[PDB]
Enzyme design. Structure first.
Site, PDB file in Angstrom:
ATOM      1  N   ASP A 130      32.636   9.474  19.752  1.00 45.47           N
ATOM      2  CA  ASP A 130      31.559   9.895  20.632  1.00 45.47           C
ATOM      3  C   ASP A 130      32.172  10.397  21.930  1.00 45.47           C
ATOM      4  O   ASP A 130      32.542   9.594  22.783  1.00 45.47           O
ATOM      5  CB  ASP A 130      30.636   8.710  20.900  1.00 45.47           C
ATOM      6  CG  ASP A 130      29.289   9.126  21.439  1.00 45.47           C
ATOM      7  OD1 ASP A 130      29.002  10.342  21.471  1.00 45.47           O
ATOM      8  OD2 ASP A 130      28.503   8.227  21.810  1.00 45.47           O
ATOM      9  N   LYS A 132      30.433  12.729  23.966  1.00 42.50           N
ATOM     10  CA  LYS A 132      29.374  13.321  24.775  1.00 42.50           C
ATOM     11  C   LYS A 132      29.576  12.962  26.247  1.00 42.50           C
ATOM     12  O   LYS A 132      29.831  11.806  26.572  1.00 42.50           O
ATOM     13  CB  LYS A 132      28.007  12.833  24.302  1.00 42.50           C
ATOM     14  CG  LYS A 132      27.824  11.334  24.327  1.00 42.50           C
ATOM     15  CD  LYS A 132      26.681  10.945  23.409  1.00 42.50           C
ATOM     16  CE  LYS A 132      26.260   9.495  23.601  1.00 42.50           C
ATOM     17  NZ  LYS A 132      25.301   9.019  22.558  1.00 42.50           N
ATOM     18  N   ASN A 135      29.723   9.755  28.459  1.00 44.17           N
ATOM     19  CA  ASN A 135      30.755   8.730  28.313  1.00 44.17           C
ATOM     20  C   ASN A 135      32.012   9.030  29.130  1.00 44.17           C
ATOM     21  O   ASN A 135      32.936   8.223  29.188  1.00 44.17           O
ATOM     22  CB  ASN A 135      31.132   8.563  26.844  1.00 44.17           C
ATOM     23  CG  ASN A 135      30.033   7.907  26.032  1.00 44.17           C
ATOM     24  OD1 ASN A 135      29.238   7.126  26.556  1.00 44.17           O
ATOM     25  ND2 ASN A 135      29.983   8.220  24.743  1.00 44.17           N
ATOM     26  N   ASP A 152      32.849   3.710  26.905  1.00 41.69           N
ATOM     27  CA  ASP A 152      32.032   3.344  25.751  1.00 41.69           C
ATOM     28  C   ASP A 152      32.700   3.674  24.416  1.00 41.69           C
ATOM     29  O   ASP A 152      32.279   4.591  23.711  1.00 41.69           O
ATOM     30  CB  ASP A 152      30.668   4.020  25.815  1.00 41.69           C
ATOM     31  CG  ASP A 152      29.813   3.695  24.608  1.00 41.69           C
ATOM     32  OD1 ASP A 152      29.018   4.561  24.185  1.00 41.69           O
ATOM     33  OD2 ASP A 152      29.949   2.574  24.075  1.00 41.69           O
ATOM     34  N   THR A 172      53.477   8.587   7.341  1.00 39.22           N
ATOM     35  CA  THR A 172      52.647   9.098   6.263  1.00 39.22           C
ATOM     36  C   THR A 172      52.600   8.091   5.118  1.00 39.22           C
ATOM     37  O   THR A 172      51.531   7.602   4.757  1.00 39.22           O
ATOM     38  CB  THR A 172      53.144  10.475   5.764  1.00 39.22           C
ATOM     39  OG1 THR A 172      54.505  10.375   5.332  1.00 39.22           O
ATOM     40  CG2 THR A 172      53.045  11.514   6.872  1.00 39.22           C
TER      41      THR A 172
HETATM   42  C1  LIG Z   1      27.333   0.912  28.352  1.00 37.12           C
HETATM   43  C2  LIG Z   1      26.597   1.491  27.188  1.00 37.12           C
HETATM   44  C3  LIG Z   1      26.517   2.974  27.319  1.00 37.12           C
HETATM   45  N1  LIG Z   1      26.454   4.111  27.430  1.00 37.12           N
HETATM   46  C4  LIG Z   1      27.319   1.147  25.932  1.00 37.12           C
HETATM   47  N2  LIG Z   1      26.586   0.729  24.775  1.00 37.12           N
HETATM   48  O1  LIG Z   1      28.539   1.229  25.895  1.00 37.12           O
HETATM   49  C5  LIG Z   1      27.451   1.588  29.677  1.00 37.12           C
HETATM   50  C6  LIG Z   1      26.467   2.420  30.125  1.00 37.12           C
HETATM   51  C7  LIG Z   1      26.601   3.086  31.451  1.00 37.12           C
HETATM   52  C8  LIG Z   1      27.707   2.860  32.215  1.00 37.12           C
HETATM   53  C9  LIG Z   1      28.782   1.950  31.725  1.00 37.12           C
HETATM   54  C10 LIG Z   1      29.989   1.685  32.558  1.00 37.12           C
HETATM   55  C11 LIG Z   1      31.193   1.231  32.103  1.00 37.12           C
HETATM   56  N3  LIG Z   1      32.034   1.107  33.205  1.00 37.12           N
HETATM   57  N4  LIG Z   1      31.356   1.473  34.313  1.00 37.12           N
HETATM   58  C12 LIG Z   1      30.072   1.838  33.958  1.00 37.12           C
HETATM   59  C13 LIG Z   1      28.657   1.337  30.515  1.00 37.12           C
END
Ligand SMILES: */C(=C(/C#N)C(N)=O)c1cccc(-c2cn[nH]c2)c1
Ligand code: NA
Length: 303
Positions: A130, A132, A135, A152, A172
């Site tokens: 992921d 996107k 993240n 994430d 391999t």
């Molecule tokens: C966590 C969720 C998402 N997206 C997840 N299921 O991982 C999250 C959401 C917003 C921000 C953070 C974060 C991590 N470190 N600082 C902010 C984590």
């Protein structure tokens, strides 16, 4: 190697507002009561997800500066509380898109930093699956690429043998099922397609396969089945040929002919950036729109 113990997450931390997501879990702001410091904690439900794959990755690879760093964790038997570093500088794409003065040389420095991070992970046989932009965040508002953090990793995966062994794409022989030599070769380039979506959106202010949150999933998936996203005219006029050529192969349709992180970094837009525009980018600005468009884009994929 996990887990349970005497100490509980509560004992060492104060919980706070829900800061985002989530599918199998909920991230929330918290504080370390000892030092009153600010961290973020992803609470995964063991009954639903299995943190194992993610947490491991984070332990080994968190050392990477541009990778979200893992500062702590617990298992209370019900959930799993993963404390990683809280990101102040907000979302990267969101931030950058509100910058009315941003230059190719400047967008080349951001993406460089991001791909150099992904190349590392790729030689280590690990795929995020992921990417996107939601993240990719900014640990602080410094606005320097060294504040960039990929986050994430819940949906990431290691490359393992059929024997369940750590492996690298280099080695391999030691046996892994054939389909996994497949799904890793895809999931790797799949990350590179997502980076294509970041660079495309970064030079323009709109995402290639969706206009807004309202787009039909079919039409987005349809636009993609083709590719042939438009690199000329509009917000594509003043931009470089180099970067245009770059976005094309990063976003190329065939997981194969499409670029690899290692080649990306060898592209002259990334290496030769010093020859690149220091002047702003005529860009459509609807930072909210673009965000909602991306959301529409990924849901169509994964759902
Ligand atoms: C966590 C969720 C998402 N997206 C997840 N299921 O991982 C999250 C959401 C917003 C921000 C953070 C974060 C991590 N470190 N600082 C902010 C984590
Ligand atoms: Na880090």
């Amino acid at each position: 190697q996990l887990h349970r113990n005497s100490i509980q997450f509560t004992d060492g931390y104060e919980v706070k507002e829900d800061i985002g997501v989530g599918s199998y879990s909920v991230c929330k702001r918290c504080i370390h009561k000892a030092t009153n410091m600010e961290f973020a904690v992803k609470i995964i439900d063991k009954s639903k997800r299995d943190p194992t794959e993610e947490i491991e990755i984070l332990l080994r690879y968190g050392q990477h500066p541009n990778i979200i760093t893992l500062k702590d964790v617990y298992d209370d038997g019900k959930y799993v509380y993963v404390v990683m570093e809280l990101m102040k500088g907000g979302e990267l794409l969101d931030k950058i898109l509100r910058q009315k003065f941003f230059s190719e040389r400047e967008a080349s420095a951001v993406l460089f930093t991001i791909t150099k991070t992904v190349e590392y992970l790729h030689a280590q046989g690990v795929v995020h699956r992921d990417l996107k932009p939601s993240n990719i965040l900014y640990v602080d508002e410094s606005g320097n690429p060294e504040s960039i953090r990929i986050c994430d990793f819940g949906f990431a995966k290691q490359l393992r043998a059929e024997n369940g062994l750590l492996m690298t794409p280099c080695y391999t022989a030691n046996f892994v099922a054939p389909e996994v030599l497949e799904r890793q070769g895809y999931d790797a380039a799949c990350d590179i397609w997502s980076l294509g979506v970041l660079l495309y959106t970064m030079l323009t202010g709109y995402t290639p396969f969706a206009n807004g949150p309202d787009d039909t999933p079919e039409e987005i998936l349809a636009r993609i089945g083709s590719g042939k996203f438009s690199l000329s005219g509009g917000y594509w006029n003043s931009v470089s040929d180099t970067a245009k050529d770059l976005v094309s192969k990063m976003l190329h349709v065939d997981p194969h002919q499409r670029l690899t992180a290692a080649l990306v970094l060898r592209h002259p837009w990334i290496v030769h950036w010093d020859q690149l525009p220091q002047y702003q980018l005529n860009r459509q600005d609807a930072p909210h729109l673009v965000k909602g468009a991306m959301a529409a884009t990924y849901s169509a994929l994964n759902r």
